[PDB]
Chain length 471, copies 4
């Protein structure tokens, strides 16, 4: 079965009974809750349906809260949706209005004040493009230069305009709070522009008394300019290609994607590739050849996880989207799990030990690699190496199981907090022997550490035959 992980975004199309359950059954490893949409009630209900389906099927499902950040947006249209055709004049106003085809609000109140004739305005990640002709008091008068359909509250991007807005708005802070309290496993922050942005997420987490891993979404040039610092200061990154493809030239995105994946794997941080991977399946039961390709090449790039957005959130074929993405990933993986090699020899204890664990298990044809982890680190350092062998993480902290749902190749087992490595090893046998997949005598390679229950104590590798007296 599949090694590459699948993130799905929840929405209107997953709101009906036991759709969430079908998604998990079809392979969803992480549920994304997008805080740009929905009411708190909708997010509670969805969260609850994910815990039910995860617990009831036995499959790990991480819940990731996506914070809107400083996303600039349109207001409402009287019709909910209009066509912006090439040649038309449109006003985007910071004043209040009855929104119509000709005149629509925006949430960015400095827009009239900061826009300059010549500026370009991409709507909805480029389904429409406009050029600013003038600013008349509150209105930015523009010409539609590339036409297309626009609708309520779609995003706008103003490439190069250097936008003033908090890294976390009042709304983001409250959504973060509600999400921490509800119990989510990870938090993603939109529009990261600095490694220091994670500090602000941590400040809130600490007031509230609870931290989880933070994912930087990469969709700003400033973020790509600071890629390594951001990969080091955050716990994960998402290549957020929708907005990245209008914040930067769309032609630069594929190499940015590839670099950012490599940078994540170099430093053992999960990385998610997001947005329009199967875009056409919003309306169609099968994807284009470019989509299938895009997904396969994200696998070969070495991405831990691929994400579906509108394909599951508002689309007509959410389940098929998930199964399809799963089939393409598996097709690549049946061929090879190899990823671009790392450009350094590991230097950290946990990196050096995990690297060696992998060598041992592959050279002996072990049935599995097994690694004990309290924070996930030791397992992340092995996962990044890719390996055809099962990579089975063991932990006593259930949150780590949900967190590891976004890490390549990794299934997790929860066991009691043990006071010794012999104890860790007995638990391995006990857990695996209750599975079909393992029987007594099977060869496994186990990484563990003492002093027990201490992050970063990893210090042993143990070649072990299940149940046999080799400890």
């Amino acid at each position: 079965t599949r090694r590459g992980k699948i993130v799905c975004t929840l929405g209107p199309a997953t709101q009906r009974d036991d759709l969430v359950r079908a998604l998990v059954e079809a392979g969803m490893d992480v549920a994304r809750m997008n805080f740009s949409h929905g009411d708190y009630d909708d997010h509670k209900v969805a969260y609850e349906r994910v815990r039910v389906a995860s617990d009831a099927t036995g499959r790990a499902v991480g819940v990731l809260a996506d914070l809107q950040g400083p996303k600039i947006r349109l207001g409402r249209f009287a019709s909910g949706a209009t066509h912006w055709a090439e040649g038309e004049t449109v006003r985007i106003t910071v004043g209040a209005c009855e929104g119509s085809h000709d005149r629509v609000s925006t949430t960015y109140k400095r827009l009239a004040q900061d826009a300059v004739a010549g500026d370009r305005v991409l709507v909805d990640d480029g389904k429409v493009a406009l050029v600013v002709d003038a600013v008349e008091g509150d209105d930015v008068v523009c010409t539609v230069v590339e036409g297309g359909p626009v609708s309520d509250n779609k995003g706008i991007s103003l490439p190069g305009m250097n936008v003033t807005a908090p890294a976390l708005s009042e709304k983001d802070i409250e959504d973060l709070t509600f999400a921490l309290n509800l119990g989510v496993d990870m938090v993603a922050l939109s529009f990261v522009r600095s490694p220091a942005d994670v500090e602000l997420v941590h400040e809130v987490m600490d007031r509230i008394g609870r931290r989880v891993p933070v994912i930087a979404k990469l969709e700003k040039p400033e973020a790509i300019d600071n890629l390594e610092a951001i990969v080091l200061a955050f716990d994960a990154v998402m290549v957020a290609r929708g907005d990245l493809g209008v914040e930067l030239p769309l032609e630069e995105v594929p190499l940015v994607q590839k670099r950012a994946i490599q940078m994540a794997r170099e430093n053992a941080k999960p990385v998610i590739v997001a947005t329009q991977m199967l875009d056409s399946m919003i309306e169609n039961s099968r994807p284009t050849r470019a989509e299938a390709s895009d997904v396969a090449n994200a696998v070969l790039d070495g991405a831990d996880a691929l994400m579906l957005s509108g394909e599951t959130s508002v689309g007509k074929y959410p389940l098929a989207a998930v199964r399809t993405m799963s089939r393409i990933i598996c097709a690549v993986e049946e061929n090879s799990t190899a990823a671009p090699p790392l450009t350094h020899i590991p230097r950290t204890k946990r990196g050096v030990i995990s690297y060696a664990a992998r060598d041992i298990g592959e050279r002996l044809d072990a049935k599995a690699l097994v690694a004990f982890t309290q924070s996930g680190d030791t397992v992340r350092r092995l996962a990044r190496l890719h390996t055809p062998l099962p990579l089975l993480a063991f932990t006593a902290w259930p949150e780590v199981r949900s967190q590891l749902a976004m890490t390549w190749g990794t299934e997790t087992f929860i066991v009691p907090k043990m006071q010794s490595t012999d104890g860790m090893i007995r638990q391995v046998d006990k857990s695996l022997l209750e599975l079909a997949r393992y029987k007594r005598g099977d060869l496994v390679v186990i990484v563990a550490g003492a002093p027990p229950g201490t992050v970063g104590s990893t210090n042993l590798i143990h070649v072990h035959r299940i149940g046999e007296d080799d400890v």
Copy 2:
């Protein structure tokens, strides 16, 4: 500037004024004429517009004739189009019919005789899928299992059914004849299933007294099963992903593509990657992130050429399709031109000499690599290596200039047939000095051969300073 080549298909959207000329101006290196559509008059006119624009701009443009081959298709509907929705019952008949929503003819007259309940029918490369429920005399009664809009003469594919059809129908043979006579530079054959299929193309070519390079289109499992023999028996291959993605699981296409590109470059045969690379630009001014990716990864795969089909033939943004594809290719190339390495040391004289020419020019920081070729082979063996250096082919046969339009990184110069290699070298200087860009004293590396005017005589490398007396 750009190395990877761009094929565009002509059609209704380019029959409008000055468009062919704009396509060439925007970068089209090969024009595809698809013999599944059009009147012979349409193809004459289009051919003519390509020669005008090529000659008037100075840019080489190969004209490639695409033969329909044994493509199975629907007949006509009595509105020209219908919607096939999920749940509906459709009859596909080999009899005579009123074509309508409920019942439509097919060109494959063995269909009732070859179909079995359970067979799948993918229409229009999978925008609709049906399952055969029964065969009643002439009619194949099916249920729509994935719905979508259908129209006149859309192609159908029947995975699992064994289709009987000639490699070349009598229509194909007449189209081939007309195309040879009109003067096209290359010929592509659809649905190749055997290395022996090229013999049948050659049989006709010889009756008529004129051969050109033949491209195998790869869109049948039998073709992938015989990939190496087909790459060796034909002069080039096109990864034809539209049909390949319904003739095989669509999830297997991206790895088939990667292997087929490698197999082409191993044996120095041009390879084209085709179909839905920028699919959404049929209706939109900008592509998805998957499309951009797909195009970039075809570059990194090492494809000589990428093709646009509906994006230029019937679409709304033909020019933007071409410029966009050009921008993404250039973006990848500005980073690196490197391609997957070859899995052998070259053994043929022309391969060994071309390989060394490349080494010399790069290690001396020469301004350009120049190779004399009569058949194109010598240049193809260098092109496959990729190299950041200009790769300038010289020939006395204009056909070879058009043919080399589909080969990576290659600009061609036509010069007189010379009777010595010194003469070949003076012609190099003459031709390059007619450029603004090139000046006396510049370092170039020139490959040539004697006895002169003999295919495969390639046997010299000469490091030469333009206009200096070093010969």
Copy 3:
């Protein structure tokens, strides 16, 4: 310290008081007792002096018994010695006689029956050469082709001739018996030709009730033709270049040496390079440039041990020979310990684990690698890799400490027979902390295995800080 080990041969020049002690003090790691010379008393007394000096200094010293084997020899001459001049006719007869200048016996009773006109006869490793002219009944009539002095019982070789003889003569068997009883740590067999020869050595070992490691001496073509089988059937090999260089053309020896060392390391068997490495120091206090080179290149070849023969057995500068050999080895090793890489990935548990242990220790800058071994195998698989880090073997079998004295880079510590791996690790700390060299908190990598006391149970790696609570 030095890593490459030094074998020394005992003889007249080491018989005097406290010389054996000075040899050990200067670095002797193995003492060779050559059973071609001396009476049993001589070997008793020598063995005794080696145990005293080893035990009193704390340096491991293996004692190796070298068995003469089916060495072919001359008989006796009436005057004990004659000069054979170039041009003279000499008979070597299988008839019994007290010899003379014209006619001398040989111990090889099939000589007249097996020799053919044309054969060459090299005496005493080639200081005199004859050509066989004829065989007349019992006498092999020869012409002296290269002159020199001969004496009683000097060895003769007939390159290319097929010798029929047991692997062990009755003298060898009795010497083996006396050597086993006296307590030697290893046994070398001269003139091995077959992997089956070790069976006969084992048959005797078993009659007597004692086995030790057996070294095949490589000094016969048959042995080089069967190099892998012999390396696999024996426990070690010695490149015995003196006889090898007359049994084969002397010009073939250096490559044979290099191959045989590689084949030993590939299969984790110790290998000794023997004979004339410092030949001139028999008479001089400093060696030639060729000698120094020869020694350095034996190190770079990857030899576990280098041997001195006449340089310590009969020479005038035995101590200087040993220190000089030590200074050259150290000089090469101070530069780099790197060795020709192995031509396979290790596949045995002990090899895979030892290889990984090495990776871990070097990548974490461990102070030492430690491996527990019961037969030495696990340590031999690490030793062959070379590593600049101390490689400290731990064992409960003292004989293994003596045996490991011929294995590269390896210092051995004897500890109690332990009943658990925790127990193994506490012993490590205890032993190392009794050195000035090691302190609490020092980082080591320990290889061990359970069940305890089981050959090949090796299955754990443990990164451990001396005395800290990390077990």
Copy 4:
């Protein structure tokens, strides 16, 4: 047949009749004349015998003049000799005297001023060692620490001591003058310490109106400290191990040898390995195993030439020394001609083109590589790569044929100075067809250059079939 070249030293043992001719016939590629011994008449006669034998046999033989340089020496003793025994007190004085056991002169007049208590004094490359106890006015009072016989004018070395003396003495200047006039092909300078030393050799060469290649002998620490500068400023280097092994610790020489050979090959300068390679053949008909090894490992190190000194100059088996050295070199080469790879990609035209020429020839199984050279450079850049294929140099300057006799793998043909490259190629065929080895249709790769007869103009590679019309 042999690729590695053999230098021999001439002396008393080759002054006997027809010996020089036998030496050349047995393989001598360069004759060394050592100007520390012999009178000018002796060197005239020897030079003459070499030209006769070279010209009469058709084998190239370079003549190398070895200049004594600022060698420090003892004066004369009353008896022509003394025995210096261990424990005794000896004075070496800078005063003039007919010496005795107690007190003998030295040619180094700053010795009392530059020696300090503790310094070592090694005589005759270390047959005797003394330690400086004190300096009293002119006398350096020492204790003999390693005893032996000394005689008139023996060389002494003072490891570490910082010596002031001109690079060339008055005697060296006159020997250089006589050697230039007599017609030698190259000159070696002893005890080079600086890149600037070659300037003073050039100053004399220019006064006299004749330059030849200069070899730096490497036998001083200062020379190893400046190894690159010296390799670049001189035309060749000799690893002069006799003095190098007393000027430095003898144990450091093997690594110095290896890196000096590497540094020569990196910069395309010939390198000679000298002294005691076959030392014991001075007295014996067959060498030790260490010697054979030393010779083989000089080949594997990548040395262009190996040198015999006393083995041919004063020894009893000069011919056997030469044949034996030839047999060992061939034995290594039959195995592989490989040399340690270069640590850079070549950057000079001649290096890049020679490197490519070799690729082409090996990949096509060309019968030979042929390179035209006016100074030898182009051929030296190919020779350093080693190649199993014949490397045939073509030149119009006969002195270059003698000079190339010390470059690896290279046989030279003299031809007319031609005024075109076509003319160069016809000459190739004509010359080679007169050999047994070549026939019409044989495949060769020819390097040449225009303008013709201009050093460094190398700029063409031509694959050519002998006698065929392919130019």
